[PDB]
Amino acid sequence: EVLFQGPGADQPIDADVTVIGSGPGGYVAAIKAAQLGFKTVCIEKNETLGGTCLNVGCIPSKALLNNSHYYHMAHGKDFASRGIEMSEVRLNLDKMMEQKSTAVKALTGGIAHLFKQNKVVHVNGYGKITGKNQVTATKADGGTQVIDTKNILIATGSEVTPFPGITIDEDTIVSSTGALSLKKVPEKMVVIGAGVIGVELGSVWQRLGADVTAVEFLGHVGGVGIDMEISKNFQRILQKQGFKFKLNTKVTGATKKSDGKIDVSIEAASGGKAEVITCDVLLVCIGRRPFTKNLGLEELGIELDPRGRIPVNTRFQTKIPNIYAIGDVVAGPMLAHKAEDEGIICVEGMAGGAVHIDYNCVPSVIYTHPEVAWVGKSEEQLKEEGIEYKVGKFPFAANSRAKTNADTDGMVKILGQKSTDRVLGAHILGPGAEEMVNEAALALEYGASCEDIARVCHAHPTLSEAFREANLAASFGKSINF
Amino acid sequence: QPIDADVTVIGSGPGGYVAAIKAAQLGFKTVCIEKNETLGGTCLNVGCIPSKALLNNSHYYHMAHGKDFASRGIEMSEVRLNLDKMMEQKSTAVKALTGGIAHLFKQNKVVHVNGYGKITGKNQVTATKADGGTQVIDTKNILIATGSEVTPFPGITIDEDTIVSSTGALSLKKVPEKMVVIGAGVIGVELGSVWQRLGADVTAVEFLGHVGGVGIDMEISKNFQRILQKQGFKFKLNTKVTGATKKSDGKIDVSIEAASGGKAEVITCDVLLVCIGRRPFTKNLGLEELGIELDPRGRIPVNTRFQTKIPNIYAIGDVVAGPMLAHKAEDEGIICVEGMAGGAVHIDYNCVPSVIYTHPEVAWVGKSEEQLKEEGIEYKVGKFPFAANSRAKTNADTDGMVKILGQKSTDRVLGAHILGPGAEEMVNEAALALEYGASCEDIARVCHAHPTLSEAFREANLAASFGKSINF
Ligand SMILES: Cc1cc2nc3c(=O)[nH]c(=O)nc-3n(C[C@H](O)[C@H](O)[C@H](O)COP(=O)(O)OP(=O)(O)OC[C@H]3O[C@@H](n4cnc5c(N)ncnc54)[C@H](O)[C@@H]3O)c2cc1C
Ligand SMILES: Cc1cc2nc3c(=O)[nH]c(=O)nc-3n(C[C@H](O)[C@H](O)[C@H](O)COP(=O)(O)OP(=O)(O)OC[C@H]3O[C@@H](n4cnc5c(N)ncnc54)[C@H](O)[C@@H]3O)c2cc1C
C-alpha cells in the first residue's frame, strides 16, 4: 500500500528515521526503529531486500555448503560405513542450485512481510543524501521521491574488491556471486584469496568434484584475526580433504586462453619462483570494501577513511550529528550479525538509550566441515598486548558425540587470564563450532571464568562437552576425558 | 593381598569413572571396581552411546532413502539398509570409548578391580570375581556409583529375544515388521524412532497423556508428538497395557485398554520393547548389614556432600535422587570427590539439561509452564519458530520453535525449551544462562553469529524481554 513506494510513487515523505540499505544492518535497524515508535523509511535500490547476506552472501553460501557436504557424505565413505548402501550417487547441480534459490526467495519475502507487519515504509530506489535532513530516491523509471527526515542511517554495505588487471565477468572469471551459481562443476578451479569466503566456496566446489587450489598473499588461511594454531591445523585438515593452498604467493596476472581455460601467473610474495597454474574457473575473492557510491558524502563534507569507510563515533554518528552509519560501510569485522547489532544499538541511541558494543564479543564462523569459530582474542593478540594468559585444549577425538558420529577432527582451545581465570578467547575447530561459539559469546558478555563454564552441567553426549572440558583444562590444568 | 586405598569407587559408569579420575587427580589413591567386562556403565555400553549412534545412522538412512537428498540434487538409484553394518558402526564407537576409559584410568593411576563389589565393613570393600576369587580393598572412603537397571513391567518377562528392554532393542538382528513400545518416555521415543526410520511399523503405548517423560513442557510435547506422527510413529496415549503373551509362532499379543478404563483391544507385534522406566541398582551391595536404608523408590539417601548415614560412605548418580542422566551423574561424582577433599559441593538440578536425540531434537533446562503454574510464579513467554530462522531455512529443516519462560517482574530466565534442529547443542548455552541467573534481555543483547540456529534462542529471549522479536 503506502508501505511500498516504488516507481510512480513520488510524493514527498516526512520521516523520523531514513535507513539507506536493507541488508542485515539496515533492515534490522528499520524494524527496530519502527518498534521504538519512529516513523521509519527504508530505501533499497535492488529488486529484493536483505542485502549482500541474503542475496549473494551468507544464505546462498551456507545452503551450498550444507548440500555439498551431504553429497560428500553419500558419494564418499561416510554413508557406506553406516550401512547405507547405494548403487550410484549422482550430482544434479541444477537441483542443488534450486534448493539454494528457494531458501533465498523465502527469506527475501520474509523481510518484506516484516516491514509490512512493522509498518516500515519501503522506498524502492537509489538513495542520495541531498541535505542534512533530506534523502532523494531515484527510481527505475527515472522518477524521484524526496524524504525529509530527522535522522539518516547509512547502511549501504559493501562490494567485491576488484583485482586490477583481472576482469570479473561472472562467466569464467567470477566473484563470490558467480561462484554461487556456476552451471557445472569446473574440472579445475583457482581461488585468489584464502580468506573466509574463499575457503568456503573453494570447499563447496572441491566437494562437488573440482580440483581446487587457493592462492594467498599472506601466510595463513582464514582471514584476519584467526588464531594461528587454529589456522594451521585447519589448513592441514583441508589439505587432507584435497583442498590445495599456495600461501605467501602473489598473482601477477591471468589470461583467458583460446581453449577457454585461464592461465594464472604467480610467484612468491617476496619475489621469485615464478610459475603458471591453469584452471577452468578463476574465483576472485581478495576482499570486500565499503560501498558509498553516489550517496552525496562529498557534498556533505563527510570524508572517508583511507579504506573507504565512513568515520563514526561510539554512537555511530558521522561528523553531521543526525547522520549515522553502521555495518559493512564502517570499521570493524564485515559480518552480518555485527551489522545487525550496530543497527539496533544505533537506533536505540536515537531514542535516548545508551550505545555500547564490545567488538571482542563478536564471533566469527567459517562454515566448512570441519567448521571454525572463535570469539574474543587469539594467542597472537594476547601476546601483542602483553596479557598473561593460560591455555586449555581439548580434542574432538576424545568427545563422545564426535566419536560416535565418527566425525573427530579438531579441538577446542580456551585462552584464560592467568590471575583471574577470566575467559579471554575461545577458538573452535571441528563439528558444531557454529552453535558452540554462541555459548562462548554469552560467557564473555558476563566476564565469566573458565571455571564458571567448566562447572556448567553440559548435556552428555554433546559436542559442547568439548568446550566444557577445554575450559576445565584452562582453569585447573587437566581435563577429565583427555 | 588386600589393597589399601583412599577412595574406592563401586561402578564405572559416567558417575563412577569420572569420580575415580577426579579423585586420582586430587591425589587420592583411588580404586574403581566394576563387575562388567568393560568400563563405562549403562551410558557407554547399553545407553547413551549406542542409542545416539543408531539415531544418527537411521536418520541419515532416512535422508538418503526418502525425499530429502533427492530434493538437494543428490540422486541415488537404490538405497539399501545393511543392518549388520549399521550395528557394526555402533559397536565400533562403543568399543573405542570403553577402551578410552581404560586408558584414562591408566593415565591417572586409577586401579581397576574387576569383580562384584560388596561393602564388607565401614572401611572395606570386597570384590568377588566371576571364578569366585576375591580381592579385598581396605579404604578410607567408599563411593557408591552402582547406577540403575531397567524397571520390569509386572507380569511381562523380558527375555531380550522377542520381548526386549532397551538393551535388546539396541541390537536387534533384523528390522521387525511390527514393534510395540511400552512407555513413550525419552528412551522409548528415541528407540521407537530408530526402528520406525529403518522400516518397522512402530506404535508406542503410554499410560499418561503426553510423550517425552517427566518435566517436559506440555506445549513442546504436543508439537513434538504431532511431528513424530507425521513421520509415521504411531502413539496410543492414555492407554494401559494389561498383559503380553509370547505366542507359539513367535509373535506377541499385547492387551491394552484406556488408562481410565474401557476400550479393551489386542495388538500383535514381532518385537515388544519394554521401557516404562529405570530404577536404582544396589543389589547385594551390603547396605542392609550396614543399616543404610533405601527410600521408597530404592534410592540411597544422601546429604549435601553425598554422604550416606555412614559419613565416609557416599553415593552419586542413578543410585540417588534427581534426574537419571549421565551428565548429572558425572557432576555429582566430581563434586562429591571435591567435598572429600574439603571443598564446596554444589549442583543445581534446575540447571541440568534434558535432551531427546530424535529428529527434530528436543531439549530443555529449567522449569516448564506447568511447573511455573504449580508454583504460583508469574511468568511471561517468548517464542520464536525455526521457520523464521535463517540457518534452519538454509537447510530446509524448519520444524519447531524455541520457547523461553521469564519471570514477569524481573525478566529472569526461568526455563528454556527447544524443539527443532540442534536443540542438543543449543540447550548448553541455555544452561549457562540459567546458572548465571541471566535475564531475557541479557541474552537478547548478546551478539549471536548469523546464520546460526542459536539466533532463535536470542530472538525468543528478545520476545520475552521486549515483547517482540525482530525476525518474527
Ligand atoms: C559470499 C559471502 C558469504 C558471506 N557469509 C557470511 C556469513 O556466513 N556470516 C556473516 O556474518 N557474514 C557473511 N558475509 C558478510 C555479510 O554478507 C555482510 O557482512 C553483511 O551483508 C553486511 O550487511 P550490511 O547491512 O552492512 O550491508 P549489505 O548486506 O551489503 O547491504 C547493503 C544494502 O544497501 C543497498 N544500497 C547501497 N547503497 C544504496 C543506496 N545509495 N540507495 C539504496 N540502497 C543502497 C545495497 O543494495 C544493499 O542491499 C558473507 C559475504 C559474502 C560475500
Ligand atoms: C537406552 C538408554 C539411553 C540413554 N541415553 C541417555 C542420553 O542420551 N543422555 C543421558 O544423559 N543419559 C542417558 N541415559 C541414562 C544414562 O545411561 C544414565 O543416567 C547413566 O549411565 C548413569 O550413570 P551412573 O554412573 O550413575 O550409573 P551406570 O551408568 O548405570 O553405571 C553403574 C555401573 O556400576 C556397575 N555396578 C553396579 N553394581 C556393582 C557392584 N556391586 N560391583 C561392581 N560394579 C557394580 C554396573 O555394572 C555399571 O557399570 C540413557 C539410558 C538408557 C538405558
Residue that has been written with the C-alpha cell 586405598 in this structure: B5
Per-residue CA distances from A316 to A29, A333, A344, B171, B377 (Å): 12, 15, 11, 61, 41
Specify the ligand 2 atom closest to the Cα of B317: 26
Ligand 1 centre and the CA of A446: distance in Å?
Answer: 30
Catalytic positions of B, written as ranges: 450
Which of A72, A356, A442 has the highest number of chain B CBs within 10 A, making it the mutation to test binding with B?
A442
Is A190 labelled a binding residue? no
CA A437 to chain centroid, in Å, comes to 15
Concatenate the DSSP letters of all residues of B241-293 into one string: EEEEEE-TTS-EEEEEEETTS---EEEEESEEEE-S-EEE--TTSSHHHHT-P
- Residue A430: CB atoms within 10 A of its CB come to 27
Q: Which residue has its alpha carbon closest to ligand 1 atom 26?
A: A327
State the Cα–Cα distance between residues A151 and A45, nearest whole angstrom: 19
Contact yes or no for A467/B14 (Cβ under 8 A): no
If one residue of B8, B18, B38, B42 were mutated to test the ligand 2 pocket, choosing by the most ligand atoms within 8 A of its CB, it would be: B42
Cis peptide before A461 (omega within 30 of 0): yes
CB contact under 8 A, B77 and A67: no
Segment holding B225, helix H or strand E: helix B218-231
Q: Give the DSSP letter string of A192-251.
A: E--SHHHHHHHHHHHHTT-EEEEE-SSSSSS-TT--HHHHHHHHHHHHHHT-EEE-SEEE
Ligand 2 centre to CA of A179 (Å) is 50
| Distance set, CA B123 to CA B111, B306, B312 (Å) | 17, 17, 8
- Tell me the sheet residues that pair with B272: B163, B180
Q: Whose CA is nearest to atom 12 of ligand 2?
A: B325
Read off the amino acid at residue B52: K
Which alpha helices (H) appear in A36-92, and where do they start and end? 51-56, 58-75, 78-81
Stated resolution in angstroms: 1.8
Give me the half-sphere count of Cα atoms (radius 13 Å) on the Cβ side of residue B96.
20
- Are the C-beta atoms of A139 and A22 separated by less than 8 Å? no
Per the CB < 8 Å rule, is B393 touching A103? yes
Residue B202 makes CB contacts below 8 A (sequence gap 6+) with: B178, B179, B180, B181, B192, B193, B195, B196, B232, B233, B234
Of B48, B86, B390, the CB nearest to A82: B86
* B343 exposure class (CB count in 10 Å sphere: 0-12, 13-18, 19+): exposed
Residue A194 and residue A219 in contact, taking contact as beta carbons nearer than 8 Å? no
Hey, are the CB atoms on B390 and A58 less than 8 Å from each other? yes
Specify the residue for cell string 503506502: A2
What CA–CA distance (Å, rounded) separates B173 from B276? 23
Residues of A in contact with B96 (CB under 8 A): 403
Binding-site residue numbers of B for NAD(+) are 183-190, 206, 241, 277
Nearest Cα to A228, choosing from A368, A366, A427?
A427
Enumerate the active-site residues of A.
460
Kindly identify which residue of chain A lies nearest to residue B462, measuring between CA atoms. Answer: A32
What does the DSSP 8-state code read for residue B388? G
φ/ψ (deg, to 5) at A234: -60, -50
Interface test with B, best of A404, A405, A458, A478 (most B CBs within 10 A): A404
Residue A167 CA to residue A164 CA, distance in Å, equals: 8
Residue written as grid cell 577457454:
A260
CA of B13 to the centre of ligand 2 (A): 5
DSSP secondary structure string, A391-457? EEEEEGGG-HHHHHTT----EEEEEEETTT-BEEEEEEEETTHHHHHHHHHHHHHHT-BHHHHHTS-
User: Which residue in B168, B175, B172, B162 sits closest to B81, CA to CA?
Assistant: B175
Q: What DSSP line would sit under A141-168, residue for residue?
A: TS-EEEEEEEEEEE---EEEPPPTT---
A15: left (phi over 0), alpha (psi -120 to 50) or beta: beta
User: Given its phi and psi angles, is residue A308 left (phi above 0), alpha (psi -120 to 50 degrees) or beta?
Assistant: left
| Cα distances (Å, whole numbers) of residue B248 to B160, B251, B268 | 17, 7, 13
Chain A CB contacts of B21 below 8 Å: 480
* CA angle, residues A107, A108, A110, in degrees to nearest 5: 60
**Hey, what domains does chain B have and what are their CATH numbers?**
1-150+277-348 (3.50.50.60), 151-276 (3.50.50.60), 349-472 (3.30.390.30)
Is B432's CB within 8 Å of A453's CB?
Answer: yes
Q: Is A138 exposed, middle or buried (0-12, 13-18, 19+ CB in 10 A)?
A: middle
State the ligand closest to the CA atom of A335: 1
Give me the count of residues in chain A. Answer: 482
Residue pair A135/A18 in contact by the 8 Å Cβ criterion: yes
Report the alpha-carbon distance of residue A59 to residue A317 in Å, rounded: 30
Query: A120 φ, ψ to 5°?
Result: -75, 130
The Å distance, Cα A49 to ligand 1 centre, comes to: 10
Kindly give, in sequence order, each residue whose CB lies less than 8 Å from that of residue B455, ignoring residues fewer than 6 positions away.
B389, B390, B391, B448, B449, B471
- Nearest in space to B182 (alpha carbons), one of B279, B47, B278, B273: B273
Alpha-carbon distance B94 to A64, whole Å?
A: 33
Q: What is the H or E stretch that residue B371 is in?
A: helix B369-374
Cβ pair A335:B61 closer than 8 A: no
Cα–Cα distance for residue pair A50/A112, rounded to 1 Å: 9
How was this entry determined? X-ray
The CA distance from B285 to B39, in Å, is: 19
Residue A96, SS3?
Answer: helix
> Closest ligand 2 atom, CA of B325?
19
Q: Report whether A463 contacts A431 (CB < 8 A).
A: yes
User: Which ligand has the minimum distance to the alpha carbon of residue B354?
Assistant: 2
